[PDB]
DNA sequence: GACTGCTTACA
DNA sequence: ACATGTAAGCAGTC
């Protein structure tokens, strides 16, 4: 049984003096075992001899300072667990999960210290964690401005702040561990929690591990959420409207839709109805023209003919190769006229309902009876379960190295794979969800402004009679009338602003209606736009050309990472 | 360069 | 040992 420690660094913010000026560590099950000091060499000496599991909140930041030390002290990168090497799990998107430091072997025992990311377990700011877990949190923060030379001596106040930060994570992590949420990440606990319910025995019988190749071609049919701005409204200031939001859309599909299980059977040509294998994926070649009065539903990515984000009214005189679930193919056929159709091949699946019942009943209840970070964690259990099923077996990551200038560089590592989970599930969950969303959007064609995944934005303020029977503020899978706005402007996908009607309840602002409102909330939704920049946005300046030099970006410099303000522009 | 790589936000 | 797609900005790559 290895010891567990909560750790943190305070670092300088100078590009060309970049260094740790303070560290802290605290035993997660013995808060009286802790140490605060001013030296990274002193900390790393402890790291080397402690033979424990370490946690930093946001390992991506602290790990840069740690790997810079390792590379300067005779440690090189190796996955082969040799003496005086470190291993990392850094993903190809650049998520840090682990730094594993190997000092050697005494018998059949590895001598090593392992460092993990507590952000993977608790993806919130430290203060949010303290508020929502109900833990002691000190007011204010360390002065990020003060001049701190080498050997700078930590004040009593800074010492208290550092100790508070490490103790908050310690207490929160311990709360989770004692419930059995002890794995590396929140998603890992979700899949493990699901396997506990249905049994591991039943898991690999119902969700067999597919060959890497079969999983790859299943994945051809795997697509995300429907994100679409009606061109009619693009860049226009508009009046009153409303937003409908599905109550947990993906889990809702998991709960009640017919979904694939088992090994698929390959077929050639056009799928022939098989009651025992009622779901399929079909490889189709065709040209297509959107029918009059229908929303476009076809997006083709990685093509020189089409912009990947654009929903297509026409194939433009080129033959489209498409891999499609039966739910998607049926939707495509309702919205489009098809030309020169070739049914090439496909895969058909056994199917059933209700495999996720107990797991979703558990976590929807925890979500409903919880608040803040604790609610968001229950939400994450539900959503990471879907993601886990569609886990990409390509786990090739990044290998750190020390550049000639003293800064960390990264190279793509040797290709590697892990077993698939069950990707057909992912295919049909998103498929049933697109179906849910698109059919509702299509039923409100005369009023539809905008869709993103689980939501429809409409003109006017009354519920359409055609969706009245599937609207509910709480029921899983139903549409909630979430808000009503006084005015809005949608510039493009994931880029819009709204003036929302609010009313006060018990001193708390709640969504209201055009007759039952006291306050107007300005809301900004803009992919890539960080929170400080959002505060700069007005109805008047929210247009193409809006720019602020306020976006923090982490720059690798000699010694570690500095956050430097970069520009963000609506192009 | 158009591309991808390196980062965030919206789901 | 590592949940998902999608959409975006900007510094690099002839
Ligand atoms: C936020 C989020 C959403 N999604 C997908 C699945 C969700 O059903 C869908 C819409 O999610 P959201 O509307 O963002 O979140 P939610 O409905 O689960 O919870 P809430 O509305 O209370 O904030 O997008 C993920 O797969 N992972 C995520 O982390
Ligand atoms: Mg939503
Ligand atoms: Mg929602």
The residues, ordered by sequence, that sit 6+ positions from A132 with a Cβ below 8 Å of its Cβ are: A124, A371, A372, A373, A374
Q: Could you say which ligand is closest to the alpha carbon of residue A379?
A: 1
Distances (CA, A) of A275 to A208, A272, A349, A355: 21, 10, 10, 19
| Burial class, A494, CB count within 10 angstroms (exposed 0-12 / middle 13-18 / buried 19+) | middle
Q: What is the DSSP letter of A118?
A: G
**Does A132 appear as a known binding residue?**
no
Rounded distance between C-alpha atoms, residue A500 and residue A244, angstroms: 13
The values of phi and psi at residue A344, to 5°, are -90, -65
| Burial class, A23, CB count within 10 angstroms (exposed 0-12 / middle 13-18 / buried 19+) | buried
Q: Are A458 and A241 in contact (CB under 8 A)?
A: yes
For chain A, where do the domains classified as CATH 3.30.1770.10 start and end?
A: 258-355
Residue A129 alpha carbon to ligand 1 centre in Å? 20
For chain A, where do the domains classified as CATH 4.10.80.20 start and end?
A: 392-421
Rounded distance between C-alpha atoms, residue A384 and residue A328, angstroms: 23
- Evaluate: CB of A383 within 6 angstroms of ligand 1: yes
Long-range CB contacts for residues A459-462, cutoff 8 Å, separation at least 24: A459/A238, A459/A239, A459/A240, A459/A241, A460/A240, A460/A241, A460/A242, A461/A240, A461/A241, A461/A242, A461/A513, A461/A514
Rounded distance between C-alpha atoms, residue A301 and residue A325, angstroms: 17
For domain A528-571, the question of CATH label 4.10.80.30 is answered with yes
Residue A260 alpha carbon to ligand 2 centre in Å? 25
Q: Is the CB of A454 under 7 A from strand B?
A: yes
Angle between helices A249-256 and A372-389 (to 10 degrees): 50
- Evaluate: CB of A447 within 6 angstroms of ligand 1: no
Q: Could you say which ligand is closest to the alpha carbon of residue A387?
A: 1
Sign for the CA dihedral angle at A312, A435, A260, A267 comes to negative
- Spacing of A76 CA from C5 C1' in Å: 35
Q: Is the CB of A125 under 7 A from strand B?
A: no
Determine the Cα angle at A271 with ends A268 and A274, to 5°: 120
| Residue A419: closest CA among A464, A383, A397, A388 | A388
For chain A, where do the domains classified as CATH 4.10.80.30 start and end?
A: 528-571
Instruction: Please name the residue ranges forming H helices in A73-185.
Output: 126-133, 156-177
Tokens 């080397």, located at residue: A48
In three-state secondary structure terms, A346 is: strand
Which nucleotides of strand B come closer than 7 angstroms to any CB of the protein? 3, 5-11
Enclosing H/E stretch for A425: helix A423-443
The residues, ordered by sequence, that sit 6+ positions from A342 with a Cβ below 8 Å of its Cβ are: A284, A285, A286
In the CATH scheme, what is the homologous superfamily, with its name and number, of domain A1-184? Ribonuclease H-like superfamily/Ribonuclease H (3.30.420.10)
Q: Are A105 and A111 in contact (CB under 8 A)?
A: yes
Rounded distance between C-alpha atoms, residue A244 and residue A252, angstroms: 15
Q: Is the CB of A409 under 7 A from strand B?
A: no
| Burial class, A462, CB count within 10 angstroms (exposed 0-12 / middle 13-18 / buried 19+) | exposed
Residue whose CA lies nearest to ligand 1 atom number 15: A248
Q: Over A290-312, what HEC string results?
A: ECCCCCCCCECCCCCCCCCCCEC
- Total count of residues recorded for chain A: 571
Rounded distance between C-alpha atoms, residue A424 and residue A249, angstroms: 18
For chain A, where do the domains classified as CATH 3.90.1600.10 start and end?
A: 185-257+422-527
Structure-block tokens of residue A58: 């946001």
- Spacing of A513 CA from B6 C1' in Å: 42
Q: Which residues pair with A347 in a beta bridge?
A: A266, A281
For chain A, where do the domains classified as CATH 3.30.420.10 start and end?
A: 1-184
Rounded distance between C-alpha atoms, residue A207 and residue A420, angstroms: 10
Residue A307 alpha carbon to ligand 2 centre in Å? 26
> Where are the strands (E) in A226-278, listed by range?
227-229, 237-238, 241-246, 259-268
**Does A141 appear as a known binding residue?**
yes
Q: What is the DSSP letter of A154?
A: P
The CATH topology of domain A392-421 is: Rhinovirus 14, subunit 4 (4.10.80)
Rounded distance between C-alpha atoms, residue A448 and residue A77, angstroms: 54
Tell me the CATH number for domain A258-355: 3.30.1770.10
Rounded distance between C-alpha atoms, residue A542 and residue A273, angstroms: 52
For chain A, where do the domains classified as CATH 1.10.287.690 start and end?
A: 356-391
Rounded distance between C-alpha atoms, residue A269 and residue A345, angstroms: 5
Tell me the CATH number for domain A185-257+422-527: 3.90.1600.10
In three-state secondary structure terms, A149 is: coil
The residues, ordered by sequence, that sit 6+ positions from A525 with a Cβ below 8 Å of its Cβ are: A494, A495, A496, A497, A498
Q: Which residues pair with A96 in a beta bridge?
A: A90
Query: What's this structure's resolution in Å?
Result: 2.2
Instruction: Please name the residue ranges forming H helices in A134-244.
Output: 156-177, 186-198, 200-206, 212-219
A566: nt with nearest C1' to CA: C10
- Evaluate: CB of A255 within 6 angstroms of ligand 1: no
For domain A356-391, the question of CATH label 1.10.287.690 is answered with yes
């Amino acid at each position: 049984p290895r010891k567990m420690y909560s750790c943190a660094f305070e670092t300088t913010t100078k590009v060309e003096d970049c260094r740790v000026w303070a560290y802290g560590y605290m035993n997660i099950e013995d808060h009286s075992e802790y140490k605060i000091g001013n030296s990274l060499d002193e900390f790393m000496a402890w790291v080397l001899k402690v033979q424990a599991d370490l946690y930093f909140h946001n390992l991506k930041f602290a790990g840069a300072f740690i790997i810079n030390w390792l590379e300067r002290n005779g440690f090189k990168w190796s996955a082969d667990g040799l003496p005086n090497t470190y291993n990392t799990i850094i993903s190809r998107m650049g998520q840090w999960y682990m730094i594993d430091i190997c000092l050697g072997y005494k018998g059949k025992r590895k001598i090593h210290t392992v460092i993990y990311d507590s952000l993977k377990k608790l993806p919130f700011p430290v203060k949010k964690i303290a508020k929502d877990f109900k833990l002691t949190v000190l007011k204010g923060d360390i002065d990020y401005h003060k001049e701190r030379p080498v050997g700078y001596k930590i004040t009593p106040e800074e010492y208290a702040y550092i100790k508070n930060d490490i103790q908050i994570i310690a207490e929160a992590l311990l709360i989770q561990f004692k419930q059995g949420l002890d794995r590396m990440t929140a998603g890992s606990d979700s899949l493990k929690g699901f396997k506990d319910i249905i049994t591991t025995k039943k898991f690999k019988k119902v969700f067999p591990t597919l060959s890497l190749g079969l999983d790859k071609e299943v994945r051809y049919a795997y697509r995300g959420g429907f994100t679409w701005l009606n061109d009619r409204f693009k860049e226009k200031e508009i009046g009153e409207g409303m937003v409908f939001d599905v109550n947990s859309l993906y889990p809702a599909q998991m709960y009640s839709r017919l979904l694939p299980y088992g090994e698929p059977i390959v077929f050639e040509g056009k799928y022939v109805w098989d009651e025992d294998y009622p779901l399929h994926i079909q490889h189709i070649r065709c040209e297509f023209e959107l029918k009059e009065g229908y929303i476009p539903t076809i997006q083709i990515k990685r093509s020189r003919f089409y912009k990947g984000n654009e929903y297509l009214k026409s194939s433009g005189g080129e033959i489209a190769d498409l891999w499609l679930s039966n739910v998607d193919l049926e939707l495509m056929k309702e919205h489009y006229d098809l030309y020169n159709v070739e049914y090439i091949s496909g895969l058909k699946f056994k199917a059933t309902t209700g495999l996720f019942k107990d797991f979703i009943d558990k976590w929807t209840y925890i979500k409903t009876t919880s608040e803040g970070a604790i609610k968001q964690l229950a939400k994450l259990m539900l959503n990471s379960l879907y993601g886990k099923f569609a886990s990409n077996p390509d786990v090739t990551g990044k290998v750190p190295y020390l550049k000639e200038n003293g800064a960390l560089g990264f190279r793509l590592g040797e290709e590697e794979t892990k077993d698939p989970v069950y990707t057909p599930m992912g295919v049909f969950i998103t498929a049933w969800a697109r179906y849910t969303t698109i059919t509702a959007a299509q039923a409100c064609y005369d009023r539809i402004i905008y869709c993103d995944t689980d939501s429809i934005h409409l003109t006017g303020t009354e519920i359409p009679d055609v969706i009245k029977d599937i609207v509910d503020p709480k029921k899983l899978g139903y549409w909630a009338h979430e808000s009503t706005f006084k005015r809005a402007k949608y510039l493009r996908q994931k880029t819009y602003i709204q003036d929302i009607y609010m009313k006060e309840v018990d001193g708390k602002l709640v969504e209201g209606s055009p007759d039952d409102y006291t306050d107007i909330k300005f809301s900004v939704k803009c992919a890539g736009m960080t929170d400080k920049i959002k505060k700069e946005v007005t109805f008047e300046n929210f247009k193409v050309g809006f720019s602020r030099k306020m976006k923090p970006k982490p720059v690798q410099v000699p010694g570690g990472v500095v956050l430097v303000d970069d520009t963000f522009t609506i192009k």
